[PDB]
Every structure is written in C-alpha cells, then in structure tokens.
Design a protein around this ligand. Structure first.
Ligand SMILES: Nc1ccn([C@@H]2O[C@H](COP(=O)(O)OP(=O)(O)OP(=O)(O)O)[C@@H](O)[C@H]2O)c(=O)n1
Ligand SMILES: Nc1ccn([C@@H]2O[C@H](COP(=O)(O)OP(=O)(O)OP(=O)(O)O)[C@@H](O)[C@H]2O)c(=O)n1
Ligand SMILES: [Zn+2]
Ligand SMILES: [Zn+2]
Lengths: 146, 310, 146, 310, 310
C-alpha cells in the first residue's frame, strides 16, 4: 500500500506543518515500533499533507481529542492485520484537561498544583475555550498559540 | 434538606433563579426576625488574602449575629503561605481539617474553585477572586433592587464604570439575566469594557443591551444606576490612561430621573459619585451596604443548615 | 519500506532515538520539500536505525559535520537522479554556531544579538564545548540541557 | 608593523610567549625612557561598566603619560545603555566611530569579545570581563615576577584564594604555562577551586601542578606566593560559606620563607593579607600595583604604534 | 568675527538657513582637514544633568580633537546642586567664572535659556533640554542628509515614532522648514503626535505636511525615513499605553524602497528598528552617529573662534 502495517494507526490528511508538532505533542517518538512519517506529501484538495504511521500502536482518547483541536481535517485509521478495521475523523470534546495553558496570567492555574481544564464551545466562527478556574472564555487561536 | 445546604458558592453561573430567590426570601425573613444561635457551635474561617472593609466585616458580623465563631486572617503576610512559601492548596487542606465553612477573598482568579478541590466536604464561599466573580455582593444587590423596586424582571439597569475588571458587575449581569425582560445600558471607557463572554450570553438569551457615551443619555429611562470604582490595582499599565473616573455622577445630573430611581454602588467609591448625591433620595449605596448583613446571614444559614423553618 | 527518491539527501544509518533529535536540532523539517523519515527500522548492523530522506535538498560540508555531534556513524548520501552520486561521513566540526546555548548564565551571549558558537574538542570520553564568548568549557552532554 | 599593532587584547589564551615577551621588553624600555608625545593626537575610551580603582586609573594615567586623550564613563548608570535601554553592541557601534581604541571593563563574561565584532577597526582592550580574563593584570604580574625573580621560567608559584572567579589567576596560570618548568601549587577552598578547563591545559602541556591545604605546606618551597580576594560580588548564595578568607596570611608565616620569595596580590586585599606583612622584605603588592603604569603604557604603545619603541 | 562667534546655541528656531549652512560648510571642511590645536588653551564644561552616551562623548571627543580641555559631570548627584541644594542659576553663575564655554544637558525644558542669563559672556550650548530642543543633533542630521541626498531642499521626509517628546524632531522639522519644497510625513501614535505649534509654523510657511498610519503608505515615496524612540522617561502614566514601538521597521519593509532612501535614527533605537535593517543599503544611523564629530567640532570652532575656518 502506500506503506503497510499489519496492526497500527495511520493518521493521514494532516495539514502541512502540523505533522511534526504531533510527533512532539503526542510524544510518539518515545517508542520502539516502526514509524513511517511522510512530511509534505500530496493531497489533491489541499495539496500538501503529512502522514504518520505508528506500527502496532493506537492513540489514547485524549490524543484524538487533542488531534480534533490541532488537525480537524486529519483522519485516524486503525489497521488490524492490514485490514483498515476503522477510519474515523476526530469530533471535538466537551473539555480538554492537563495540556492547554490559560492566557490569563492571573489565573490560579499557573501558580498552583492543578491540572488545567477547558470547556469547548464550538463557535460558528472558531473554537471558544473556557478556563475552569478563571472562567474566561478565549479563542482557540489565542489558547493554542505556540 | 434545603437546596443550598453544603454547596460551594463560587460563581453566579452555578446558581439558578430559584437558588437566588431562596436567599432573598430567607434574607427578608432574618431581617424581620433575628436568629442569634442559628449557627451556635459552628467555627467559620474568614480567609482574606486581599483587602476589604465591607465583605469581611459584614461577613464576620453576620456570623456573630447567628452565633458562629470566626478564625482567619486579614492578610496572608502572616500566614505560613506568606512567610514560609506554602501553597494555597495546602493552606486549604489544613484549614479544612479545622472549620465548618471557609469564606475567602483572593487576588488571582480561580482561587475559590481551586480551594473547593481541597476543602474536602467543607463549603467554600467566594468573597471575591481577583476580577472574576463576587456572588455574595450580587445577592445583597438583588435584595436591595427588590426592596426599592419590588420586581427583578423588566427593569432598566445601567452599569457605569470599570466593567472589565469589576467582578461585581460580572456576577450582577449574570444574575439579572436569569429574570425576564431586563434591559441593560453599559457606560464604561472602552478599555474597561464589559467582557464579550457576558455579552455573548446576553445575546444567547436574547436580552437587550446598548452602550452609551454618557449617563445623561439614559438617566431618564433607568430604574437602577450601578456605579463602579476603577480597579487601579488590577489595571495593566497600558490602561493607566483610565485610572481617573470618566463618568462622575453629581447631584445635578439626576434632574430628569425617575422618582423611583436608585443609584447603587458596591463601594469603595473614589471620585465618581460626588458627595452631594448622598443627600438626594436617589442615593442608596449605604443602605445597600447595610443589606449585606441580611444576605450574608441567609446564605450562611442555608449552606450550614439542612432545613430552616423561619 | 521507506521510498524511491530521485534527487536530494538521504542521511542513512542514524542511530535509533537520534533521528528525531537531528530533525529538530538542525531545522530540517522547516522546508516545503517532501521528507520521509523512517524511525526504528531494522538494520542488522545495529539492531535498529533511523533514516531521513530530504528530497531536492543538498547539505553543505559543515552541515554534514554538525551531525557528528549526535550521529557520527551516519552516511550522508547525495543522490542525483536516482544515482548515489556521493557518500559522505561526518567528521567533528571545529565549531558549532547558532544551535546551542551556553550553560553559562552570566555569558554575554544571552543578553546581546550575537549567535552562539562553541569550539568542539575531542577531550577523553565525550566531546567538550568551549564557548566563544565566556570561554568556559562544558561537556557536550551538559550543553544539550536541562 | 610590530606584532600587536591594531590587535585586540581579549584573553591571555590568544597571545604567545613572544607577544608577552615583547610587551615586557617595551615596558622595561619605556620605564627607562619615557615617550611623552608617543600617542599625542590619539583619543582612547575608558569604559568601565564595573568598579575599579587600579585598572581604570593606571590605564588613564598611562594614556596621559603618552600624550593621549581619554573620554568614557566610570559607571553605566547614566549612559543610554544604563538609562535608555541600549545594547552593548550599539554602544560599541557608535563609540567606534569616535575613538582610536576602547578599554572596557564589564560584568558579563565575553563582553570584550562581543565588543570586537562591533568595534570595526578599533582595538578593544579587555579590562576584565566578569570572572573570565584580566590580560593587562597579567602583563604587569609578569613584569613584576621577572623584575623580582629575574625569570619567567622555572618558578614555584602558589596561587592562594578564590581560584574560580579569579579572572586574574585564570589569565596568569595561562601566561605562565607558556614558559618552562613552572611549578603550580593551588590552594583554594573546594568551592572556589581552579577551573577544570585550566587544569586540562596544564595536563596536556605536562606542567606539574598540586593542591595544598596550607600556605605552610608550600612556604619553604615557593618563589611567588600570589594571593587573591574572594570575589564576593560574583558568588552564588550557595557559596556564601566562603565569603571570608580561608587562608589569611600574617608576617609570622613568612618564618620559613625562601629569601627571594615575594608576596603578590592583584588587590584589593581585604582580610587575607594582614597589615604586618606590609613591613616584611617579602611584601611586593604595592610595587606590583605601580608596575601597572609601565606594562599598561607598553601595551598602548604597541597596539597604537606600528613602529616598535626602539 | 564669523556669525556665530560667542553666540549661545539654544534652539533651532533662533538660527537661520545661513547659520545652519555655515556650520555644515565648516563640518565639510574640518572633516577634510583637521585642526588639532584649533582650541588649544580653551577649557569647556561638559554638564550633563541627564544620561547620554552619544552627545556627551561625541562632544568631549570633538573638544579633545581640537586641543581643548574638558571639565564637568555626567551626573548631578554629587554636585552641590545634587547634594547641597544649590540652584541651577548659581551653578551657572560660578561655572561661568571658570570655563570658556558650557555644554549642558538638562531634564527641564528651558534650562539652557535659563543658563544664558547667568553664563555672563560664556556661550551655553544646548545639549537637550527635556523634550524641547536638541540643536546639535539636528546639525549632524543635516550634515548626514546632505551627505546622502546631496541636498537639503526638495526632500520627502517621514518622521516616525514619538513626535511629541522628540526634542530631536522638534528641532529637525524646524531646521528643514528653512529650506524649500520639503515634504513632511508624520507617523506618530495620536498620543505622541507632533506639537501643534510646530504644525502652525509649517502652515504659515505653507510647507506641505501629511499624517500617515503606516511606513508602507510612504515607503515608496520618501528619501529620508527618520525613526525615533518612545521617550519612555518623559511619558505620563496616562501615556503608558504607548511605551512600545507602534511602528517597528524590518528589512522586508524596505522592499518598495526608493534606492536613494536612508533610514536615520538619533539613537538609542530600542525595538523600532529590527537588527536585520542593519545590513541593508538603506541603514545609515551609525554613520549618522559618527557624523556627530564633524558637526560638533565645526560648531565649537565657530563659537570659540572669530576667524572662519578657512
Ligand atoms: N496494511 C495497511 C493498510 C493501510 N495502510 C495505510 O492506511 C491508510 C488506509 O486508508 P484507506 O481509506 O484504505 O486509503 P484511502 O481510501 O486512499 O485514504 P482516505 O479514504 O482517507 O483518502 C492508507 O493511508 C494506507 O497507506 C497501511 O499502512 N498499511
Ligand atoms: N535513488 C536512490 C538512491 C539511493 N537511495 C538511498 O541511499 C542509501 C545509500 O545508497 P545505496 O548505495 O543505494 O544503498 P547502500 O549500498 O546499502 O548504502 P550503504 O551500503 O552505505 O548502506 C540507501 O539507503 C538508499 O535508500 C535512495 O533512496 N534512492
Ligand atoms: Zn484561567
Ligand atoms: Zn558562554
């Protein structure tokens, strides 16, 4: 196929310049099983995509929920014994925990030993995230600005 | 079991029209009939990590009038969090092994909700968290609006001042949006303007609000005029163009006001309400202040008593 | 198993775990070229290797030598129109400028707009690094931080 | 032009036994025969971003004693770097368009190397960059050591004190490892011990060095006992165990001192060299200080004149 | 004696196109042909009651490069004004009995005019009085503009940045409104916009000026893009919205830049001129800095010598 894995995940239709953030973000390289990464491959509709192939590994919930916020386009394929047993595109969650960082500098979340949490109101415009602690709602662009 | 028994009172969002109305019902009651041992034998912690004259002294007086004991601090300077670098999380964990409810004021937003994750089963009542919520204020404002106007539906309410950093007007617009027909007029410097997160909610419920450049352009139409203080201590230095009050109410400005109109203020005030207003029948900010005793006794009673019969 | 490539550079034989590290240390990903990385491939030579093929991209002599700091046994393969036109090998560079930050806190490099630079030294176990500015020598392990 | 004409002087590690020897030759010459107009029409910047009594005044007097003009600052506080937030790099960029040479003392290590990338064609003379180099100190230490011991080769040299931040002993251990058969005795607290990178260089050149816990252990054996100050300002709080002089020297100690030996100190001395040493045959640190004029004007002369002074 | 002999230099508004032209003529002359003893036997006071790197050192080097002697202070803190409470007026009264000319930088506007009423016969050269005038800055800006554009008439000049406290652009807009057909583009934040009184003068002389919200709007059109710093120290707290550079310039921006255009800055530059501009053909601010020596010693020469230098 365009590579081939017996069991594993193939995340595909990843926007150009996101694939590599995902290797850092989901810590995918702390692994020993084969990884095929194709940076800046074609994808007819939106020209240049990335593709990542983690053989014999499937993502935990949090990761696919994060994937929904970093790559809504992407598709996750569960391959068992070369059978594309499942292919799903990530829907947004209700809440994101322990990975985002509140834009409000005066949030108690910074100072204190707490896992962050955000509410995910899908606005027609974009994604508005609400901090659990300070109750400020923010644009996902603001929050995810790296 | 009453509905607010053992609840944390943190954000007005978490409360319903029914929750609010139960405290005002209770408030008017304790105002007509004192209960001086209702909380006999409970010790309560008044933890103020930020300055107060009204919320702390009203709270401690309400506690005393019901028979409770108070333990606390006026400033963390003296706590082991202030001198020995302990966390807030740890401060709340041991204080909760000592007392029956924690009343706290804190400079960072979210402190209160943080505390409830460590209070065990002990109720945390929020006295103000930086610029976020101030629910107990709003309870005594709703009580005063009701005494003066007899309705909390279809009013014309103007909020004037620093609406950005004002935890007071944040909680009040959320609570008043739980009643039908209230019309909002917002007069603030645009840099100390009302958060769009409150606005979106007023638009999610189809409530009408408008912004105005002057008090005089809505004076004639308001039931309540709610003045606020520029939160100097909260201003980012970009906003120092805003420290001195832009809209200052003077006695003469009330000339074309509804005879039923009231000027409310959370207090402290600085230059924004000229002392000559004080002598008019429209000034009602010290009455409002006195009303914090009834609203704070009601809330303590409901949180700490499974059923009240009064 | 990885891919056919017309023209570019294939750094082959990268030690497992060092392939992601290289791609992030030298800005290799920040391109618009098709890159295809194969992590944790079987080698025999070593148990596992890593490999990076950067299409339509050629590395300079110093570029390749910088790799010796993490991948000395790599083979930098120059390919022009499917023919392995060259097989280079990283020697130690004499200086690595711009990618490392001096662990010396009171070094002038942190405050002023100058690039970093370290003179590389083969000392006696690991590679020693002498800052250009403060002139202190640090082992390379250290320079790659905490 | 002579080896050092227009040449920057940033670290002893970039000079050679030949350069060091030249600078001392010229110092010997100039001490014997003054050259008052040697640098007539030259303006030098004295830029001390850090305190100095010795370096700054010996340097400026040497400039004056060759007919030069000095402009500069003893403090960064009222420079535009100091008040208007300007980078060192731009300070050096404009100051290069004005003077013929720059003498610079700075609190950061590498400040002078940074300065040579922006001084253009102008030589930057390092007057001490934090705890790294002090190359002018060393040229007057070599001048005083050769003055007293008659040689720079086959000397027994005890460096006592703060060997870690001693920019002075960094440079001096490096100047003396260029000559032959010099023996090093390093007496620091462990905390403020000689840098490894120095030791390595001694190892590769196969110089014999040894660590001692006492002046007495080495007293009978040495020729130059060179004392240093705990660089109080440069210590870590962790290091404040060592603010006082572990090894303090008094005249009694010189009892079993080799009759040729000299006590040297870069100065300021704080508590480490008791004032009774001041009357012994051995004490030479004030003569060492004065020797700064000769070494300093020999350097200036070489870097700003093509023609070797005679 | 030449037009400017013993003449005080306090504001560009007291000079004429003839004076400005003379000072540049002499600068052109002196740059070509040094006069080392021109002011041999003259002592000038360098009195900076305010920070400086550029003005103070270019001025003192220029004094030295004409054979003069400099006395003075880089700081008022250890003067008797600074510690013993003496008036400026008496500082000037005694310092007049000692030196031949006074160069003075002061934090108050009008300090130099005040100084000419007490300097007696001694010329006071204004080195910058608060946010008012900087006349020496301007003479080296005119020297650099004529050096690059070959003329001081019919120039397109964009002054970007803090136009309100920019003592530099106050003086420079006034020097260039003496020549002809110069076109002014003023790009400030509204808060720190060009003084009215300047604009009025432009209006009466019928000079065309225009306000722009972007460098791009004027980039293709201009000859001199003169950038300034937000005079952080001089801002009101109200004004602290504008502490950062609204208009920041990077090399990309120069894409549609006229090939003759030069970027000028009085310096220090903080964030407004990105270090990549430093490598463009266009960047000229360090050359502009060096041009301070020529303009500064031409001024000194004219005010202290009767006989025009040649
Ligand atoms: N044994 C397998 C089977 C599939 N794949 C990869 O997993 C994906 C399988 O999805 P599939 O829908 O069958 O291919 P497409 O239809 O082209 O992908 P899409 O429908 O999302 O456009 C393909 O990228 C393929 O390279 C694989 O690595 N190994
Ligand atoms: N058109 C080409 C030519 C070469 N290669 C890559 O270049 C590397 C080295 O060149 P080659 O001689 O073809 O393979 P090897 O002989 O195995 O190189 P070595 O023996 O040193 O591993 C191989 O890993 C191969 O993937 C390639 O991908 N595409
Ligand atoms: Zn938050
Ligand atoms: Zn360094």
């Amino acid at each position: 196929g365009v590579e081939a894995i017996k069991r594993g995940t193939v995340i595909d239709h990843i926007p150009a310049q996101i694939g590599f953030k995902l290797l850092s973000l989901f810590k995918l390289t702390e692994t020993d099983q084969r990884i095929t990464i194709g940076l800046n491959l074609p994808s007819g509709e939106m020209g240049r995509k990335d593709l990542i192939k983690i053989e014999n590994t499937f993502l935990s919930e949090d990761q696919v929920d994060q994937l929904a916020l970093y790559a809504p386009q992407a598709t996750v394929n569960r391959i068992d014994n070369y059978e594309v047993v499942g292919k799903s595109r990530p829907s947004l969650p209700e809440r994101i925990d322990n990975v985002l960082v509140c834009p409000n500098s005066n949030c108690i979340s910074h100072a204190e030993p707490v896992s962050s949490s955000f509410a995910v109101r899908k606005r027609a415009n974009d994604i508005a995230l609400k901090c659990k602690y300070c109750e400020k709602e923010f644009s996902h662009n603001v929050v995810l600005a790296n | 079991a009453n509905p607010l028994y053992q609840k944390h009172i943190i954000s007005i969002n978490d409360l319903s029209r029914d929750d609010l109305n139960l405290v005002l019902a209770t408030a008017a009651k304790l105002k007509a009939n004192p209960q001086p041992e209702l909380l006999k034998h409970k010790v309560i912690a008044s933890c103020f990590f930020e300055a107060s004259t009204r919320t702390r002294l009203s709270f401690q007086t309400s506690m005393h009038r019901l028979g409770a004991s108070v333990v606390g601090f006026s400033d963390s300077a003296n706590t082991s969090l202030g001198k020995k670098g302990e966390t807030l999380a740890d401060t709340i964990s041991v204080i909760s092994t000592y007392v029956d409810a924690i009343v706290m004021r804190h400079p960072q937003e979210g402190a209160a909700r943080l505390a409830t994750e460590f209070s065990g089963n002990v109720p945390v009542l929020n006295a103000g968290d930086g610029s976020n919520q101030h629910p107990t204020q709003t309870l005594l404002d709703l009580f005063t609006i009701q005494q003066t106007e007899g309705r909390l539906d279809n009013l014309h309410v103007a909020m004037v001042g620093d609406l950005k950093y004002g935890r007071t007007v944040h909680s009040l617009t959320q609570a008043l949006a739980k009643f039908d027909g209230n019309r909002f007029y917002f007069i603030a410097p645009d840099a100390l303007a009302m958060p769009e997160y409150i606005l979106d909610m007023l638009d999610e419920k189809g409530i009408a609000w408008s912004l105005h450049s002057s008090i005089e352009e809505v004076m004639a139409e308001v039931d309540i005029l709610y003045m606020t203080r520029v939160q100097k201590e909260r201003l980012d230095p970009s906003e120092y163009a805003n420290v001195k009050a832009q809209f200052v109410l003077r006695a003469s400005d009330l000339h074309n006001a509804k005879a039923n109109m009231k000027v409310l203020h959370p207090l402290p005030r600085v230059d924004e309400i000229a002392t000559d207003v004080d002598k008019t029948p429209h000034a009602w900010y010290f009455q409002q202040a006195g009303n914090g005793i009834f609203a704070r006794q009601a809330l303590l009673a409901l949180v700490l008593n499974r059923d009240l019969v009064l």
